[PDB]
Ligand SMILES: CCOC(=O)c1cc(Br)c([N+](=O)[O-])o1
Ligand SMILES: [Mn+2]
Ligand SMILES: [Mn+2]
Ligand SMILES: [Zn+2]
């Protein structure tokens with residue numbers, strides 16, 4: 001393709017647990033990450049949606065990370081649209097998506113600069129791991145948990 005994502009986590013590389021949450025009534029949201037080297041960031045956003053905040057969190061993880069990065073997301077949309085764009089680049093049956101295309105195309109630019117990326121989906125779940133902590137962080141003031 002235009003790139004290849006890793007098929008299993010990159011051993012040794014820092015992992016970013018990304019998440020975003022938005023509120024449909026106000027279009028307010030937050031995107032951010034926590035990492036397994038004790039890094040964290042949360043941004044507040046306006047005029048956004050849940051899909052945009054999930055994508056924005058991924059963008060931030062690519063922005064702030066080294067050449068090799070492990071990314072854990074709970075958004076099937078974000079993983080799919082990114083993986084589809086890579087797999088179907090400059091190829092026959094491609095028609096780029098309508099929604100979020102500006103955000104997705106900036107993500108793709110961040111991506112090909114990387115050496116190696118592992119991007120995986122896990123369902124939102126409860127507990128104390130990374131997805132749980134970043135969920136609470138992006139959900140604060142946006143959504144009851
Ligand atoms: C605010 C609720 O917790 C989350 O951040 C969250 C839940 C779901 Br469900 C998704 N998603 O991308 O499928 O992200
Ligand atoms: Mn999420
Ligand atoms: Mn979540
Ligand atoms: Zn390397």
Ligand SMILES: [Zn+2]
Pocket residue numbers: 125127128129130131132
């Ligand atoms: Zn977890």
